[model samples]
Target chain A: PVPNPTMPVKGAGTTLWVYKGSGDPYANPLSDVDWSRLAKVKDLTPGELTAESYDDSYLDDEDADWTATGQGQKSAGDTSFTLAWMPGEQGQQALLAWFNEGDTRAYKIRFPNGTVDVFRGWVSSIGKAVTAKEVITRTVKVTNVGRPSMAEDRSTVTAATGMTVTPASTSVVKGQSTTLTVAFQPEGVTDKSFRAVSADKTKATVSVSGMTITVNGVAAGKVNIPVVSGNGEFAAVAEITVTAS
Target chain B: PVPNPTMPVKGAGTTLWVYKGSGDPYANPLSDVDWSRLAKVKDLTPGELTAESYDDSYLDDEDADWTATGQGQKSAGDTSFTLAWMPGEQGQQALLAWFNEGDTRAYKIRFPNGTVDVFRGWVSSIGKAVTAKEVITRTVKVTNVGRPSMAEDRSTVTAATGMTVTPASTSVVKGQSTTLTVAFQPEGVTDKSFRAVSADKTKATVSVSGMTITVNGVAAGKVNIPVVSGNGEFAAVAEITVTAS
Candidate 1:
């Protein structure tokens, strides 16, 4: 029997963000994209999700018994997608530019509701075919070379909720530092993730862990230090006026 | 005649931000605080403002006539203030710490209305005296070593105004870069200053100049890139997921 048959079924498409590098990776992949080399990819074939485990079973004299063993590592299969409406001049140029260099790359699949799945791999194959209407279509395949991370939702309810920061403004000496605190009103289900940055690094430097931000005076200048919620939906700044001692 | 008898007198106190450095002098000292080793000071004594100029005049043949020449360079008189609350334990420790190095420092006098004045020099003397009530007080005298800056205003009207950022999410490959844009709504003021930073520099790196932000893919990981107003009052972040390419 179908459960909740009266309810309508719904699903969302995915948006792919791709990049190429060989150093330290990003902490949150969905938030950063190389605009110059971006692709609004769609019509992707679903990926495979698999896990390794063994079933323990033995023939008994009276009854049949079976047990499940601990599950091992999990893996996500490769993904294939069609890049429709790719132009010959500009649209196709950005995507084809990557083919010149044979190297591994990165991809982030973002769901409609803001969830993101990150995959690291390379372009396994590219097939081009002409349809009856004289339309050229490209089918690109990506093979997961590294481990795939599960979907992550980095969304914060900051707009509707009232959030505040303490000591909005302060003064610090060069080569010294101070701490700023943040609080969320009407707390909701979310991670207490926060990020900080200095308006001018030459004047001061900023770092964050959860809700606390550390403002370090680097040079004698004005540094506007903004402490932001991890979701990037809201923030508050501390106008740190650095002076000489 | 008085401008208006019904009008009330209005004025604002000045807050001092001090620093220390040696380099080429600037036209306005207040506009260029050392910012590296800065300090915030209050309760300052009034200082003198003055300038010097030499006018060139010439005599005529028939009648004694004088023609004015160009105006000479201007200068501000030296200023000395007492840090009433600075002590060896807390308040004064930050200020006196600089004395041990014996290096020339800078000071910025910020007015209540946002104007500022900068000066570079040192603390010439520190005097300690005990009152009849058995209270000990410290008086430090500062001497202006170099030229005093004219005026500056480091305050920005960002929080009071509406600002925003767009494309809340993105992705990239290791060793690549991306860009983010910021906007200021109801744009009536000047300076579209903004700052950008990665939630995790180990995974990604962020840089900013004006409204454009550059996110560099450092390795295969996730990063949250937050674009903040230069004043640090408001911000928005783009989720950047970096994969191996």
Candidate 2:
């Protein structure tokens, strides 16, 4: 078997729920189910969310002026698919009522792999068709209003180990900045956090947010950047040397 | 227990070749004997060549404008070590003759692990010391004139097999670009070459150099980029769809 949290639920089952307004869907699971529904588990074209980056370039005596500057502002791509169900008229009316309202709504889609995508978006377009003896198919197109937060199966991830910080040792000129990347074993888990502290803040200062750690050289000296787990389970350190280049 | 090119050298005895000028020192079999030598081979410090990359970055609001640009050049660090030998004064004069000439020369160093580094450099510094009663030791520092070419044990690599291309399926916008990567069975062999072709050049043009396959969108249509080895030993293909975003 490939893995769970994938499509076509191998063992348990997959479910989806759409609700109005804002609240943590994981906390109040079934409380806001005015439009709760189930699929016969027919063919599911799994949804995908893509983040695209723009390039920055300049004209020169080269092949083309367009060079990838860096990853620019991020925007999420919209995904949609169709579901065939045998829901009764009452079950169909519940979905129709929410669609008629024509307002932004939050949705929680639980995949068989135990990951969830919770986002606020609006239905851009929808279609309904009766095919082959009253099997109604609903085609939904969702346009995400903003970034969507993905909740992954963190329980599968054990404590961090074999932790290594990249540019593990580096040198930076005074009054300059350098970046550090930290990686650990069991690669797919995203729950790891990073932290750094300079031995002498007067000579250099370390700033960390998310996966990036930057060191600012205030004077010619050395600094040690320490990394630790957010829950304080593991710790590692990296060194940096500042030069008056 | 280690393998060798000559003598079927089975009982753990190895040799080093230092010659004048370029070309295959192994082919001539002890010819051009300006300085022919052998070692009782004791305390060999394995050679090392390190390539370092320099990064430049800038800072802005919210860690957004920070970007790293390449240094656009490769500079290798100098490495040297000592070797203990039982050579007489005749052996010491041969090395001193080349060291005294004050000119860059070519050399080939063969390691026990069946790897070789051939380069045009000079003995930047050297030392001959009589440590004990009669054991003569020589310390040599080699400064590479340019980048040395590393040759590894390719005899262990068979014809390619089980090759697969990544981004097996992708969609790109018209006039945009997307990249595809490839992987194969024998991981460390660099002799592998990749070539990609689009079924419809009017829709997209595929260019592959190294392992990255870049597809440039030319129009709104579908195309399949088929990847194959330049020598026609391995083959795999990926599908691409070009849409008007």
**Candidate 1 residues A1-245, lDDT tens each?**
23211111123334566654444444656555452333545356535443343333455534322121323344455778776656764646655665556566667765433445667666677788888886566887777665555431223322325457788778889778788888776554233444465545667877665457788887886665656654444555567788888
Query: How does residue A75 of candidate 2 score in lDDT?
Result: 38
lDDT of 2 at B230: 34
Clashes of each: 57, 4
lDDT of 1 at B94: 42
Query: What's each prediction's TM-score?
Result: 0.37, 0.30
Residue A14, model 1, lDDT: 41
* Consecutive 10-residue window with the lowest summed lDDT within model 2 chain B: B28-37
Per-residue error at B49 for model 2, in Å?
29
Write out fnat for all predictions, comma-separated. Answer: 0.01, 0.00
Off by over 4 Å in 1: A1-225, A228-245, B1-14, B20-42, B50-75, B84-104, B128-138, B145-147, B152-167, B181-195, B208-212, B219-222, B227-245
Q: Pick the candidate with the highest TM-score.
A: 1
